[PDB]
Write a protein that binds this DNA or RNA. Structure first.
Lengths: 22, 98, 90, 79, 102, 5, 79, 95, 102, 90
DNA sequence: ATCGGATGTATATATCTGACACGTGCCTGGAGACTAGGGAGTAATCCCCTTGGCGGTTAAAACGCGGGGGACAGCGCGTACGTGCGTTTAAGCGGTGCTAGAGCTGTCTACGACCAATTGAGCGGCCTCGGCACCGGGATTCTCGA
DNA sequence: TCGAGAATCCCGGTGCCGAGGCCGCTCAATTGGTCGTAGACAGCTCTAGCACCGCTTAAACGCACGTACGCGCTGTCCCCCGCGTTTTAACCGCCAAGGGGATTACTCCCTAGTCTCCAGGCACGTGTCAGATATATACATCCGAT
């Protein structure tokens, strides 16, 4: 009776930080 | 038997004047193969298609090094460090390297 | 002539208790439009590349994978696939 | 392993064209990062175009369409 | 109806007309407007849900532009999508640099 | 005839 | 004279939202520059849209079309 | 009787939390009038049209100040100077 | 012909069909493709002229990508237009920072 | 199916002595295309704003003023205006 | 490191306004039903060119050892920005009033879509040659240790 | 300031292949019709943008003050540049397979196009409660004293 969800993170940065893979 | 930094200037002007690709063709060739393998297996690349990747890649990198160097000089230093590269991408924003 | 009434329906689905201000409604309305044309243009430009004169579900799906970043594209495709398959039998 | 296909003097001269004087040691590894990142984004979009055309071979125009779709417009390989 | 047969809230009928008169192609598919309607509705749901959750923390039952701003700028995929766009009177995420603190 | 060298 | 309509504490608090601690004196004048430059570019396109519509009154939608036409997309005033 | 820089931080968090326009309404209104005079004479602006300018302008400046501050800190200093503003725009690119 | 009546080199006829099949509008005007053909030819002439004079001083009679790059990136108005695009194998303008010299 | 033969004609007018390589020819060919769609899209988007279903010289002219920087836009308009006026008689 | 005084800030509560939400009447845009064209799915084809093997040449990558020099921490001088308080400027609010001009509507004229027959501009394929890459050798220019 | 040494610019000869000019061959552009409607156009409605009056006071201006931050300079050192040597393997030219791009030939079937029909969704009223507003107050933070 509601709605679903996914995988959320954060700004997560870049230029030095990680990028997401699977 | 020159001075630490003299040859550095020599290679700058000789490469800015030239238009030749600065990275080897074959190592870059197989590099694109590996990366494309993750998205889809058994892919074929046109001879010009790889060149398109190589041109855009070098162009982007050179442009990135320019912005990096500007950040380096701004920090009152003449040597570029990863500290400069990271900031250069952050100021560029998302579209500018992500 | 907007999506005001539909976003409100979707709102009650995710949150039947809370409401939305007119300013935020306009933002969400500008949002779904900016999502519409962005995908539509990319899909149109996509069919033009392949010399095809028809925009189909296949073009829209490919457009999603190009625009929507990771993990968002996947669920967007699923939500789209689920919709299409329902209107395929009925 | 293959990402190390590009070399240290290769990166070193890429920075020369960029107009830099002194280059740190950690730079070469950092440069390999942004290169693999850049290539992934382009190829991902490039292959996406290829798959939509029902083809197993990526072409020059596919790379052009991908590059132009992210502010990295490229002249010289079709238009 | 069609949007009701699609199990969606967004008007598949209206969207179909916009893809036609909007001059994107000569021939618009039958499933195409349905597919796009499901993507728009999803993203709308994805944003609204995060907005409402950001509204509950502000002790407010009405979603204001500030709530939307907080929602988008805290999700990687959403923030990346709406990177070039700026939300009116949404403000900015409270961020203070490390070396600026006592 | 614009700005030039 | 009218460009000085915006004030020193006005710019000062704009930088607070930007998250800065100490602000130099020449900043306030430099900020007036980039503000007048930004307004010039937006309004130029905005008025251009207004003139093409055969109107003597610039509207909100005209500004939106102008802003969105240079990577400065704005939500809340139409779309 | 506080300290030089302590109140500065207090004003930071107080403005980041708010969504209010940081610039005055009326001076900005006539400011847009002046700039528009060069392109076309005798122009009228919708009540929302001027607000649209103020939102985008303020948003852009704040965003610019953020990129500016990072350049300031990069020079091992906490005070922002015109050197930072100019560099921040060069790296950002066009438009 | 039409382009000959237009006093232009670029084909007004070919351009006219492109505005049709390109899906930009339902009805494309008669003067519209002529006007656009005059703008395209001008910019093309503007680049070629600046490229060629920059090619003759390099003692070459054939325009290569480096010449085009030198032409575009040395003109204020032109460089701003083609800012986002990168010319293949065009190289970069020789620029060395001030503080890097002895 | 390109503009290869036309760019060469324009080249000989401004410079009958010099020639152009095939690679650089492709670059210029990509240029006039990137100029074409850029103006065409803007003109189409312009008419869509005014709810007009027709792209005309007026749309193309206004599109030029939006895209071309400044000193280039003026001459581009003049070069465009002169052409249309030629097609009014002959 | 601990403590109270002083400042600001989050918090509880109560009132008050106005904007959000729901309501109804109305209409025009979307759903049904039908026909007909032609873009596209589909099968079969031609052959372009991408991939992969051996094998020699050698430009270039890799390795190592000085050591000049720039990255870096420290630190002393001092200007300048922040903080605070009092004086001063107009933004903000709202109120009233005129009118330019956005917006709308009904005309009917001019214009582009449309089709068909025709044909010349333009694409694809083909040599031919001279611009340019290649090269070697000497004139010129910039760098650098006493 | 002086000359020795190493690089780049440059002048002329030779050889290579790509660019430029020709040539059939389509097929897309042109001509010349007609038909239908988008839009130029004039009249009308009235929203709303502009402008001045005038009271309130939040906010901007100016000023005095102190500190901590900008910045210059001396010290340390280790790391990156420069050079010569060894090692790797990119580069190039050749030969060979066949996957699959590009192609084409038929024909199905999916979508545009229409008229009628009616309900989804707009405008536009109507009332209420979430929230802006205010105020008294408990709680959280900074700061000087020790």
């Amino acid at each position: 009776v509601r709605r679903s969800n996914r995988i959320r993170l954060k700004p997560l940065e870049y230029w030095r930080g990680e990028r997401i893979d699977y | 038997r020159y001075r630490p930094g003299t040859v550095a200037l020599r290679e700058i002007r000789r490469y800015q004047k030239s238009t030749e690709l600065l990275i080897r063709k074959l190592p870059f060739q197989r590099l694109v193969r590996e990366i494309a393998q993750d998205f889809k297996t058994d892919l074929r690349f046109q001879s010009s298609a790889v060149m398109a990747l190589q041109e855009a890649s070098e162009a982007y990198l050179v442009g990135l090094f320019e912005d990096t160097n500007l950040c380096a000089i701004h920090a009152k230093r003449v040597t570029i460090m990863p500290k400069d590269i990271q900031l250069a991408r952050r100021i560029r924003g998302i579209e500018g390297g992500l | 002539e907007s999506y005001a009434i539909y976003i409100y329906k979707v709102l009650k689905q995710v949150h039947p208790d809370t409401g939305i201000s007119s300013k935020a409604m306009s933002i969400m309305n500008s949002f779904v439009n900016d999502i519409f044309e962005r995908i539509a243009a990319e899909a149109s430009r996509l069919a033009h590349y392949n010399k095809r004169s028809t925009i189909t579900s296949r073009e829209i799906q490919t457009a999603v994978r190009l625009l929507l970043p990771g993990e968002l594209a996947k669920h967007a495709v699923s939500e789209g696939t689920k919709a299409v398959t329902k209107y395929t039998s009925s | 392993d293959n990402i190390q296909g590009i070399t240290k003097p290769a990166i070193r001269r890429l920075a020369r064209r960029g107009g830099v004087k002194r280059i740190s040691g950690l730079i070469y590894e950092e440069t390999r990062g942004v290169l693999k990142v850049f290539l992934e984004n382009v190829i991902r979009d490039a292959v996406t175009y290829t798959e939509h055309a029902k083809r197993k071979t990526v072409t020059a125009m596919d790379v052009v369409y991908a590059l132009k779709r992210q502010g990295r417009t490229l002249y010289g390989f079709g238009g | 109806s069609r949007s009701n047969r699609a199990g969606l809230q967004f008007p598949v009928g209206r969207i179909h007309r916009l893809l036609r008169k909007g001059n994107y192609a000569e021939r618009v598919g039958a499933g195409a407007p349905v597919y796009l309607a499901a993507v728009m509705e999803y993203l709308a749901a994805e944003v609204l849900e995060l907005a409402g959750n950001a509204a509950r923390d502000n002790k407010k039952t009405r979603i204001i532009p500030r709530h939307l701003q907080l929602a988008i700028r805290n999700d990687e995929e959403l923030n990346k999508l709406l990177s070039g766009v700026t939300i009116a009177q949404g403000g900015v995420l409270p961020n203070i640099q490390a070396v600026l603190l006592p | 005839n614009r700005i030039r060298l």
